[model samples]
Structures are given as C-alpha cells and as structure tokens.
Target chain A: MESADLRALAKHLYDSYIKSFPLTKAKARAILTGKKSPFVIYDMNSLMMGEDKIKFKHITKEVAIRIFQGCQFRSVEAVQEITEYAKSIPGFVNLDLNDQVTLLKYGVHEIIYTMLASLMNKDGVLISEGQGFMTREFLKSLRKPFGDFMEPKFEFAVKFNALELDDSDLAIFIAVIILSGDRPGLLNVKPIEDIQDNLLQALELQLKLNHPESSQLFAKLLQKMTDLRQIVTEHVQLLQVIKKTETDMSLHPLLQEIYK
Target chain B: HMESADLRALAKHLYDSYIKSFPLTKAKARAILTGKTTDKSPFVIYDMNSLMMGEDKIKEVAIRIFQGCQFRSVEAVQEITEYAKSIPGFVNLDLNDQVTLLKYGVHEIIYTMLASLMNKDGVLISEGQGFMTREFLKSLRKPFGDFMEPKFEFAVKFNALELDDSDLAIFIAVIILSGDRPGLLNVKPIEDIQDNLLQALELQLKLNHPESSQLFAKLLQKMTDLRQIVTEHVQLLQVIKKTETDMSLHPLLQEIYKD
Candidate 1:
C-alpha cells in the first residue's frame, strides 16, 4: 500500500499540475526580460479615494487607488485558477460540491501564497500573467498599514523562490495542501484526510527523487507550508483592518465572501 | 555490444549527414573561408539596445524567424530519423515504437543540436549568418515569444558541455533509443541499444575532454532539463493553436502536439 505506488501517484499529480498551470515561468521570464509589458486593468473605482488621507506627498490618490484596485482585480483571477487547480487534485472532485467549496473557501489563500513563488524572485512578483511587474518596494510605498499587508508575502516569496522547485514538485505540494483535513468545514473529513495522507507520502517520494542531495528538503518544504498559513492568517488580519478603518474601500463580492 | 570503432564509424557517418542536413561551425567556417558565403557581412548581429521597430514589426520578424527555425527543425528531424534508423538495433523495434520514440524524442534532439547555434548574443539563424539577439528574442509575442528564453537558457548551458559533432551524434542516438518512451514493445533490446550509445557517449567524452570528470552526470542532468523544456515547448504549441485560432503550425509539429 505504501511504497511502490508513489511513482504512479506522483505522475498523476505531475501531469495534472503541468496541464493546469502552464506557461507561468515562461511568461514571468517574458515580463522580466523587457519584451512584454504587463496588462494593467484600469477601472473607475481605481481612479480616486485618498482625498487628504494621503500621507506621502509623492503618491497621488489616483495612483494609489489604481494599484490598490489592480492587485485585488488580479486576486479574482487567481481565485478562479486555483479553484480549477484544486478540483483537478486526485480525490477532490469526488467530494460533495459543498465540501469542495468548503476546502477551497478556507484553503485558497495558502495555495495562492505558495503559487506566488512561481511568479516571483528576489526583487518582485510578476503579476497578471507577466503583464505587470509589482516590486516589493512598491508595496512598501503604499500607505502605512495598507503597505504592511504584502510585507510578509514579499519576504516569504524570496525564501520560497530559493527552493527552485519546478512545476512537478509544486503540483503535489498544492495537492497535499488542498486535500488536507484541517480546514474548517470539511464534511468528507475522513476521505479528505486519507487523500492528504497518500499525497504527503507521494510528495516526500517525489521530492527525494527530485532533490536527492537535499535530505531534509521535505521537512523544509512542509515547514514552508506552515509559513504560508501564517502569512494568510496575517493577511486576513490586515484585510479586516482595511475593511473597518478604510470604510469607503470596496471589494468584489467574491472578495467580500472569502474575507468576511 | 558495439565496439569503440563501430561507435566511431557510426558517429562519423552521423556527423557527415548532420553537416549535410544542417549548418554547423565547420560548415559555416568553410563557407566563409572559401568565399562561398558572399556579401562580406561577418556579424549581422541584430542590435539589442535600439528599438528599430514597433510591436507589429517585431511580430513580423518573429514570424519570419520562427519560420526559419521551423525549416531548420524539419531538416534536423529528417537527419535524426535517418540516424535513428542506423542505431544498430532501432529497426528491431515495432513500427509503433519507432514512431513513438521519434515523436517524443525529436524535441530533445533538436534542443541538443541547437547548442551549436546558441551563444550569449543569441541563436544564429538562416545559415547566411544572422544573429538574433537575446533582447530581440524576448520581444517575440506569445506562443513563439515563450520559446526563446527557455531555449536560449538551455542551449547556452548545454553549450558548456563542449561536445563536438561525434559526441553529439552519439548523444542524439542515445536520446531516440531511450527506454523511457511510452508504448515500448520490447524494453530489453531498446535498452541494449541505449546503453551502447550511452557507453559510446561516455567514451567519446572522455577521449575528447579528459578534464571533464563530471561530464557524464552533467549530460544526464541536462537531459532531465531538456525533457522539461520540451514538455513546455509542446504545451506552448498547443496554446498557440488554441489562442491564435487561425494561424497554423507546421503539419509535422502539429502531429506531435496532436496526441
């Protein structure tokens, strides 16, 4: 039950991962290398809000809102992609759609922060399919606590990037994360836990094969998942601060459902 | 088991056919020395710093360059097919297996040969001596746009192997005859041929580059890298067909992407 089947499970996870998350690195390279500029989505609400709340003399209210709104718009796209990715995990679709939604509703932020490693490097995270470049500095440049929201993610991203994981490793890691039993409303809890157990073993076997010399790399990666959860928790904390303090700010209903 | 002499002879013919099918340093140098390559332009290096054109012009040049690369690949695959047929035991496989190996293995083979053409400046195309700068390669639009960075990245690193024509001949031979391809009717005979070429590759590497103690492991690691690169390439080809909706891939490439 335990040993020989690792390769079979790993292959399915690898192929599913590859098929779903195609062309991210290629596009990231494109944006970084100066060929393609990122597509910036500009909408009306993105235009102006800060009035005299602007602490920095340099950043205009319009520019701040433009960026504030831009990343959230991208957040919706991220949710859809991750939703599709989660469903393709080996045992996920078999769950009742409610359980499926429950897993995703709670688990998406962890997946998003982890997947961010693919589109990032030391300095910046490439956004919008390499359509836009958002530097870590630019995040810090935003108003005080608003700027603080992304700091942990940016910090975590650089360390995560050092792992140099190809798409195959990433696929199983996400699968393990998505299928785990620890989330809030998992009704198919036993079956979900079973899936997570198998995937955890598979992730170990595959990482050993991929990173043979790095003996503790599996534990290292697992610890990093713990780090992602912390980042998301911090994220929810600031998101609340944004919601209450900055009352005029608006988010899409999807964002509101996920955060609230 | 092939003797060292058999490996050498096979590789000689392989390299002969290779230079015939595609231009190499030897071929290009000979062309320049004999004044066969006319018009005196030694380095038609596309300048990276200046913007000579708009997105449309860049796209047009990209299409033309992509066209050139396709023609070269078509020729390279033909040469590979011929060499694969000569790999001592390849013909013993089922016709189905032969096609499967060729279908999957040719991208890796093409990437191996592309090392000869790649440099820090970028890949040289047209055989008439035009250099496509790395900066220019980045400007290419999606589908084709994604091709250059990974290709150049792989090609440049692979170039470090310093494999000459004979070594490359055995390397590509080992590639096509690898046992990992699906639909293997008989794994034993294929592995037999695989190890022969593999042995030949190591011996040839040792003879030519004695200082490269890690060459064998490096080549295998790079093969792993090549596998991923080809996978990405095929994925992009699929995306190109879907995204463009109207533009076409070379019929040959489309067949590989089809299944």
Candidate 2:
C-alpha cells in the first residue's frame, strides 16, 4: 500500500479503538461518585472478574497479592488489546513471525504505559477497571515487590498526563511506538521504519491541524516518547526483581515472554 | 539580531565546518562506521567475521562499535560546541543555560548529523573504514547488535528527506537554542532564538526545497527520530557499562549518559 493510504488506515484504526476506551478519569469519577452506567459496569467488571480482585471487607497480604495479580491481569489485557490493534495494521502481520513476536515482546510494555498515561490524572491512575482509582500513595503503601512494580508506572503516567495530548495525538503516538523499526530481531526493518516514518508524518500533520496554535506540541510529544522509554526501563527492572523474588506470583505467559 | 541572509550564511558556514571536521560522504562514512574494510581501506576494519566466529568475539565487536561511537561522539561535541559559539547571541545565554542546552541537546544534534552519514544500506561509523551492512550489525549478539540498528534505521529514512546544509544549519540551531531543556533559567530568550531559527529554516526550506511542501514537516519529524536514536544509544551505553567492567566510556560520554 502507498504510505499515505497506510497512514490514513492507521489513523482510522486509532480513532476507532482509542474512542472506545473513554478517558479513565471520567469513568473513575463516575464509579467513585456512584453514577453507575453500563460503561462503568463493563469496565468495573473486567477488573472485578480478575483472579486478583480485591475483596473490600478485609485487606491482608493475600489481598495485596491478589490486587497485584489483578493489576498484572489488567496490564496483560492492555497488551492484548495493543497486540490485536497492531496486528490490524496492514504490514504488521506480513513481517516474519519471529520479528513480529520480538517487536511485541519488547514494544508492548512501552505502548501499555503510553496508553495508560492517557487514562491518568493528577491524583492517580484509574484501576479496578475504573471502579477503583489507585493513587500513587496507595500503590506505594503496598508491600515491597508490589509497590515497587506499580509506583514507577504511576510516576510516569502522572508526568505523561501533564502533556494533555488529545485522542488523535495519542492514537498516532501509539501507532508510532508499535510500528517502530528499532525493535531487536526485525527481519525487514526498512519497511517497518517506513511505516513508522509515515505515521510520524501523519502525526505531525495531524498535530498541526489539531493543535493549530501550539507549534511546540509535536516536539513535546516526541520528547514524551523518550520519557516513556525511561519509565518502561524502570518498570522492566522492577519486573526483573519480581521474576527473581516471587516465582510463585506467576506472571502471565505473554508478559513472561515480553519481560524475558 | 541577524538578518535572514546573514543567518543563512552562518548556517551554511556551520554546516561546512561540520562536514570538514567529520569528512567522508554518506556511503563512505557508512562503510567505515560499519567496519567493512578491504585491503585498500585507509582505516582498520576489525575482523568482525572471524571475531564473530568465536563466542568471545561477539563482545569484542560490540566493544569496538561502542568505543568507536564514543570517539566519534567526542569529536562531534567539540565541533558542535565551536559551531554554536560562532552563532551570534548563542554565547550570550547565561553560561549555565548554555551548558544545559549543550548537555541535553548535543546527542540529538549528533544523531541528526549522523543521518547525513547514512545511505539505503546502512551508516558509516568512521572515515575510510568499510561500510557496515545493516544485516551484519543486526546479526551480532544481544545488546551489541541491537544498539546500532535503530540509529541506522532512523538515518536511512532521514537521508531520504534530502535536506541540504542550509536547512540542517537552521535546524541544528533550533535544536541548540531549544527552550525545553529541563533546567533552563530563562526559557523566553532561548525560545525567542529558536523561533527566529525556525523562521529562518522555514524560509530556507521554502526557497531550497520548494518542490516539496512537506519538507519542513519532514525535517521536524527527523528531530523526533533523532531523540529516539539517542534514547536507544543511551540505553545501550547503560547496558555496556553494567556488563563490561573493563570498557570505560569517556568522561564526556559518561556525563551525557548519566541519569
């Protein structure tokens, strides 16, 4: 496909998926304030149905482990959604299977954190599928390994949310992260980089139209990608710690591969 | 305040100086940088093939690339520092802001220049060295192979834009005078300078590459690509520092990569 058409397709996919996931802040507030709607119920249940759902009656070490497990499940689902979206890109599926897996294994967490940033606000990230908002304080209050994994993501999300990129900006940004050619073990990198470049071109063009008054927005968003990389690095390190200390925790197979 | 023509001339001069300091056309530079040497080559190409033949040779080639990058980076810093100082009003920024901008902005600028050293095949690591194919670098062992691939990927695409020195000069100026460095004492002045450079770049791109309306946007996109390259470079450096106790990075590089 021509680069222009591919970019349009990407933008189209981004619009469809990103819009379906409403801002976490809005959903979290609705659930917190008892404005239960179908959206809130669906999102809340996704969290509640997790094997690690927190039982409100009592908070124990087991409860914390369960919450952590629930958080991991949420992370896994986020990765799954990103993977499905990535596979939807025209050329993504055409790459060598090993290369595709390599890209996903390395790139998924970064995309997850980038998307999570969209759902974040000053207080904290929306958790428990928006039924519960996990503030940075609350996450840090958990035991050693659990808090270690969650705090860095919250720190990154807070700073990332401050950028205030609208949905269009984010959709394309996510595409850029996924379509990156730099992932190790890429068989045909030029085409992959070409896709990323086209997305970046479309993204800049969109930023110009969407943020007509803000000339610096494009550069700022790119800088945020760098910040996202740093944050993901810390998250990966924390994961390494978990892999070592808590073997029984049972990281999801997909995540185990990603972190490997 | 410089006139447009004067700024344009300054941009050209800076670019010429950069090319002179780091000689070799894009293809030749890629050859040398990648360590593909023949008998007639002016520089030494480590026998990466034989080195790769042995298990220990993997780390050896990785170290060579790392060390080569460090050497080239230091030279780039010197050249860019001289270029920035030559620009009017650049040195007038508070000495502290000057350092901060250079500290934060140098790697981005270096990667931008490195794009000029790339062709469709891959990048040139050093002058007179044989070209390094993208495949060879990617095939090396973990972390080592991964380090150079992203920069090469970014460079090849960046080269496609075909930006001339006039455009790059103003672009580099915009990069250097950036107001976004985290610790700037007075961003207004830096931003004002960046705006001026941006206007100069836009006007120059219009005049030079008028056939392509998207040239300016493409150039801005390359800046983002540069940031990603530098991010990967830093990550690779961190990995090297952690794994290879004997391989000491130069002080300036250490400072640049320091968290």
Candidate 3:
C-alpha cells in the first residue's frame, strides 16, 4: 500500500479505537457518524498480515529506531541521529536507480532538523538548509545569552489539540532559515491546495480501510487526523487571505479560533 | 492762700445771692431793675421760642445749664442725675430720679436728648466710627469666631431687625439691657439690638467719656431712653385716639412730638 494510504488507515484507527475510551466516546461517535474518518491504524496483527508492500517487520524496525534514537541522543548528538532517522523512514527512500537522494521529504526533514538544532549547545551548533532550521537554531542560541535575566514564572503542562502559529512567526522562521542558508520552498512552503487535497484523500482512504475490529482505536485516531487536517487547512487559508486581503476580517473564523 | 480762701467765700456768697433771686423772665427782671411803677403783670417767657430753635438747640442750652449749676468734679452719673433733677418741671418729681425714671419709662427722653445732641454738632466722633456703620452692623451677625458654633449670635441679630423702625431698634435695645430670654420670646429680638447698641455705646464712650465707665452707663441709659420713648408714644397714641376719636391725627401729632 502507498504511504498516503497508510496515513489514511492510521486516521481511521483514531476514529474507531483511540476514541473508544470512555473519556472520548462522545467525540468518537461524532467523528464516525457525522463525518468520514480521516485516520488508519494497523495494529500488530494487521501490519504483519496486511497486503501493503512495506512489510510489518520493516515498519516495526523503523518505529523502534525512531523511538530509540529520539530518546538516546540530545543536542548535537540528536541532530546526527535525526538526520540518519530521516533517511530510514519508508516515505523518504529513494526509488530511482540513478538517484542517491534520501527518502525524507524536504518539508518533514526541515521540521526534524529545526527541532534537533534547538537542542544544541554553544559548541554543538548544527546547520541545516531549511528556514525552520535557522529559526530553531536562533531560538536555542537566544536562551543562552539571557539565561539568568528572566522573571520567575509558571506554566501548566497542557496537551494541545491544535495550534496555529501566526504568519509573522512563520516569516521570522523563514528569515532565520534563509540567513542560515536554507532553501525556503523545500522547508517553509505549504500551499492551501496541498492541505485541501490531503484532507480529501485522508477521508477517502480512511473510509476504505474501516473495519469493525479496530473501531474504538480508529475513532480516536480519526480525531487526531482530522485535527491535523484542520490545522493545515486553517494555516494555509490564513496565508492565502493575508496575501489577498487588506483586513484580517476576511479570513476564515477557524484561523482565529486556532490562534487562541 | 488767704486770697484763694477769700475768693472761694465770695464765690459761695454770690452763688447763694443768685439762687435767692434767680431770673425767671428777662422782661420781669428788666422791669424790677428799672423800678418801673406800673400795675401791669409780669411778662411770660415763651418756651416755644427755645423750642422753635430746635430740640437739639434746646438740649444744648439745657446741657449748658448743667455746666453752670452742677459740680463738674462729681462722677458723670451723679452730675447727670443732679442736672436731670434740677429741670423746672422735673424738680421734686420722681420722674427725674434714676430708678423711678428708668422703671417708669423716662429713659427714652434721655436717649432722644443725647441722640439729638450727638446728631446736631457731631457729639460722638471717634476712630471707632467704622464699627458703628451699617456694614459693621450687618457683618457682626456673620457666623464667625466664637460666634460660629451653634450660631446663636447670628440668629439673634437676624431676628432683631424685623421692624426696620428706629423706635423698634431702640425698643430692642431696651430688651437687650434686660438680657432675659422671655419664655414666649426668643433671644433673636434682643441680640440684634445688643450688637447695634453695643457698637454705638463703644463709639460714644470712646469719644466723650474715654476715661469713665461710660460704656456701662450708656447701655443703662439706652434702656431707660427706649422705655421713655415707647411709653410716650403709646400714651400720646392713647390720648389722640381718645380726644380726636380717630387714629389719623395721632400719626401726624406723634410725628410732631419728637421730644
């Protein structure tokens, strides 16, 4: 099966399984009855016996490596491990016989690289060819200088269902990555059509993969998938409206809702 | 020293001689001195001539008579009492005596006498004239100083000027001398007159009797004077109402009887 198809399966799993828990039952029902699922989940059983080209063994190994490496390395070490991990993910594998390019898509690679750079110490600076990478590096470096010159404050640990970082923050990320010598298109670019296409495809594939066995887990998974699609949709629309309109009022209501 | 004693003796002898044959009328004296042999009666001295000159001029002449007859060395009250007693119609009359005159309402005559004298030739002139002005009278009732709390003084003064008549002002002054808040009457009536009469008394004593306890004397005199004036006006009103059988002649005749 295609990676896109796999992602859709994972989204269905959210609607059918993750949302089966008592706490999320109401939400699970809403996603299943009111809207088509956007998630897929391949349990250990499905992954082993599924008809997908990517074997369950391969997927398991990759997941294990991602978890292990993510936990083991930090700062500069984490940046190296992340780079290796990006090449190993199935979606990033180079299929062309002549091409030696890595399997990681440029956008995904940028997000990971930026996160890795954020963990670096002064002597362990890691560079990447992505606007987001530069933003991460700058934020990391900024903390060091003003380390002690901050007010003591508090924060509640919270799980975010969705978030909409403003265009100004995105623009700053772009500026920082450009200064760090990253290609803006590969890292910062995400068009509105791409997000809309993803949502449609996610819904279609999740519906095709629906099964009674993983109903509970799939329902919860669908919620997460739908949330992700919503985030992308809102951000893309914000960028589009901002480019076309003089006032922010013309933008989608969800954009502002996600912002708060 | 011997000449001085002889001069005093001769003076005493002349005063006694003058007393024994004091001139009552000018024409009769002229006739007696000339030894005129006529069976005609003595000429009458028209007091109306003196009265015609004005009440103020008559009071001046009367005061001059006091200067001539009374002992100047005596205290002011004593000298005034003796002079009041010496007036012809007033002699041997309890009306001239202090307690009787003051109690029976002759005090107003004295106020008119003094007021007329003061008005005629500027009798009560002093540096404290500012304190006696209408502005002072009006402002003294202003709620201030020890007079502020409860504002009794201000209230008293405000109620005293209700009548807007000089006779009422004098009437109120007499009530102030009484200094008793009658059961039915409030202190307001007397308080207005107290402020005014006190101010006038201060000026009078300051100018004319600066060394004497004349402030106290004038306050007493004001009470007596208002009593007399009120009494006389009341009596004349009674007389006019009885004789003319009307109130019309009373107002006119009352206006004419200033003294």
Candidate 4:
C-alpha cells in the first residue's frame, strides 16, 4: 500500500509534467548559468513590486508597448499548455466541467507563476520556452505603476528556485495547486480535496527523497504556496490597473477569464 | 436602502446566472462557489471510466422533483407553528398577521433547525435512515436543487453554531416575530416581541456559549441572513412558476408562498 501510493504519484509526475513539459530541467539549468546570451524578453507587463534598479531605467513608453505585446502572446500560449497539463492529473478530469473551468480559471496564473520559476533566476524569467530571457532590471524600465508587476513574481520565483525542485516535485505541486479545495464555486469539493491530498502527499514524498540534504526545504516550500497566492492577488490588482489605464489593449478571452 | 422587491429580484438574477453555470448539489448548495458546463448550464451529466461506473450516472428523475420536499415541509410545519403558538408574543399577535409570520418564517425556521440533522459527511434526512448526497439533488432537476440548496448552505453554517434547544427556542422565536415582513398591520407589537426575543437570545448565547464572545452578535446576524435567504427562496419559486409551468407546490406551502 505504501509503495503503491508513491509509485502511482511518481508515474503521474513523470507523465503529467516531467514528460509533458519536456527538457524543462535542462532549459532551467541554462538560466542559472549566469552567462548565456539569451534573447531578452522585455516585459513592460506589470510586476509586483518587491524595485528600482539602474538597468531598468531604460524602459520607455515605446518599449513597453512592444514588450506588453509579447507578454500577451505568451499569456495565450501559457494558458493552453497549462490546461492540457492540468487535464492529466489523477482527479482533474473527474471534476464537474464548470468546476473544472473554475479550477483552471483561478489556478492557471498561480501555476504559470510557479512554473515560471523553472526558467527564472533573480535576474529574470525565461520567456518563449527559454529562447528569450526577461531581465528583472529591464521590467522596471517601463512606465510607473504598471512596470513593477513582474517583480514580485520574480521575487517569489527567485526564492522558489532555491528549493531546487525537479519537474517531478513541481508536477505534484502544481497538481495540488489546481486541485485545491478552497477554490470558489467548487461543486464536488470533497473530490477536489481528495485529489489534493494525494497530490500533496506525493509532492512531499518527492521533496523528501530528492532534497534530503535540506531538512526544512519542504516546510519552506509550503510557505511559498501562500506567498504565491498573495502575489497572484497583487497581479490581479496591477493587471486591473493596467486594463483601466491601457483601455485599447484587451486581453485574450482565455486571459480575460480572470484578468479582464 | 433598496426596495425589497428589487433587492429580491437582483438576488434572483445573480443566483440564476450562478446556478446556470455551476450546478448546485446538496453539498455545494451552501458553498461560495467560484463552471464551462455541459448540456445544462450547471453540469447536467459527465462520463467516467476511471471513477464510478455508468450505473451511478445520473439522469432526469421526475417532473415534479419539488413535490416530495415541499410535502415534507408542509408536514414539518406542524411542529414549527405548534411551538410558535406556545411562545408568549406569538399567540398574542393578530390572527391574520400570525398566519403571515407562519408563512414567511416557515422555510427559514426549518432551515435553522436542519443543521441538527447534518454531520460532517452530509445531511441525514428521510427518517434519519436515508442518506442524501449533493450529486443526487443536482440530478433531481431544476428549481428544487436551486431552491433547497441555499437553505442547506444556511443550514450547514447554522449547524456550526452548536446551539442547544434553549438557544433554538428564542432563535426560532425571532424568526416568527420579525417585523421586516411586509403587510403587518400591528407592526409595533411584532417588532417589540422580536426585540424582547433578541435580548433573550443575546443572554442565551452569553450564558451558554461564552466561547464566541460575539455569539450573541453572530446569532443576531443570522436574523438578516435568514430574512434574505427566505426572500431569495420566494423569488426563485416565483420565477420557476413563470417559466416552469408543470411544477406544483403543496396547498399549505402554496398558500404561504402566495404572500
């Protein structure tokens, strides 16, 4: 019974994330090298403030429009990839379709932000499948109020990256995020919670085996989940501000599910 | 600040759209849900190979899904009014107004008491033998699930208060004697009666459950929650009648809803 649970979870992680999001660990490794000449992703898209660096002062209104446009393109792409990933989690498919939509609706941002840690270092997150590196200092170059949106996200990612969780741990972790019982409007809360228990269990197991060197890693990782939630809320606040200010730029319908 | 009828209609439309997208089961009827549903706006049906078999798959049950519950509610009214009559301010109220209070308070009062039948798993209704699940009610069809689900949500939360019989005595009294109901000719008497009951309730929770220092204030808030609860219930029933012509209410319950 004990090993059965662990194997099933490990298999799920292998299929759902490790394989689904292939080459992720290798791609993530490149970001940490601190030397690769990655194509810069200029996110004039909002960041959660945690900033004002010298390198970021180069952002102008013209630069923000181009960068924000790129971010919108990625937002659409990110949602679908995450949606397909969520569908394969053990209990995800069993949820009521509307409830399924609800979980995805609220969950996608947090999941994306968490996954962003993979392509991220304190400097910036990888965009376009690690083809382009977004610099932390560069985001601040954009105009006030909106330019700071990604900072808290990167702030969180920088700390999260320290956990050194592989694709397997992240798979279980993101699955737990999507299957959360506390999500609003859940029809079958028990099942979502049930699924979450398994996901959470598997995640901790992965952490224990993988990070035996750091005893407190899992505990600190759990704290990051709450930190992610807080950051997500600020993203919404800043996103709304951007939406109000940037009236001409409407988000993709998928993005509009929460952001718009 | 707003007219009761307008406020009631706003509640109906909002809840209507809500249930339209995400189905309310007995379990979730009371949850703060946050659904791209199926054939129905709420999830009507889903297929499962990995989970439960097709035998457990739900289908439309009855045209008159509401009849049994309302019939049960009608019978249950017996115990509700009998005791309300025993309370001091109740028997003294005008005969016409007494019926109105009975009419308005019936659902809310019953809902307040139903938390007792509930446990962590689900509610134990039907002679305390039969088990009612949330998914079962969603399959029971429109209007019924929509109506009773809100009550159950309130019922579940009310159950958490863990108030004993002494606490319920005055609490139910507050429901019947509320002055908020429209068309009360002698509103002052009912209002005064409710105020006295309110005072007794404050003292009751204070003496009984001292843990929630705000227990008195908390129970007092349920007063408005029930009013709003009972209000939306009536509007939903009213909207159902307009669109769903086949549904029927029991004579006594119908008469009560007539107001």
Chain A: TM-score in each model: 0.81, 0.76, 0.23, 0.82
lDDT, ranked from best to worst: 1, 2, 4, 3
Cand. 4 Cα-lDDT: 0.63
lDDT of 3: 0.29
Residue runs of model 3 more than 4 Å from their true location after superposition: A1-260, B1-186, B189-193, B196-200, B225-229, B245-247, B250-259
Worst 10 residues of 1 chain B by lDDT: B49-58
- How does each model score on TM-score? 0.46, 0.65, 0.17, 0.46
Question: Model 2: residues >4 Å from true position, as ranges?
Answer: A1-11, A22-66, A83-106, A141-148, A185-198, A247-260, B1-75, B86-89, B107-164, B174-259
For model 4 chain B, give the 10-residue run with minimal summed lDDT: B32-41
The candidate that wins on lDDT is 1
The per-residue C-alpha lDDT of model 1 at residue A79 equals 78
- State residue A159's C-alpha deviation in candidate 1, in Å: 34
- Every model's DockQ, to 2 decimals? 0.01, 0.15, 0.00, 0.01
Put down candidate 3 lDDT per residue, B1-259, tens digits, no spaces.
Answer: 1243443343343233323332222233223323354543222212434323433432343333222212221222333344333322233333213233323223333233223212111122111111111122123321211111112222232222222122222332233233222131333333333334333333433444455332332233224224424444455345534654322332322333344
Best by TM-score: 2
lDDT by residue (tens digit), candidate 1, A51-155: 233222222234555466656655666778788877777778998888889888887788888887777766666654454456667666666576777677778
For residues B142-220, what per-residue lDDT tens digits would candidate 2 score against the true structure?
A: 6877876777777776777777665676788788997767789998888777756765676678788877644765566
Q: Write the per-residue lDDT of candidate 4 for residues A1-260, one digit (tens) a residue.
A: 27578768777666767556744866668665854465564443332121132123212225566466656556667788888888888768877898999999998888878887787777766655555566787875667664686577677777687768877777777887788665778888878867765666576677768887654344446546656776777687786787688856655677457534
Q: In candidate 3, how many Å is residue B146 off? A: 49
The parts of candidate 1 lying over 4 Å away from their true place are A1-260, B1-21, B25-59
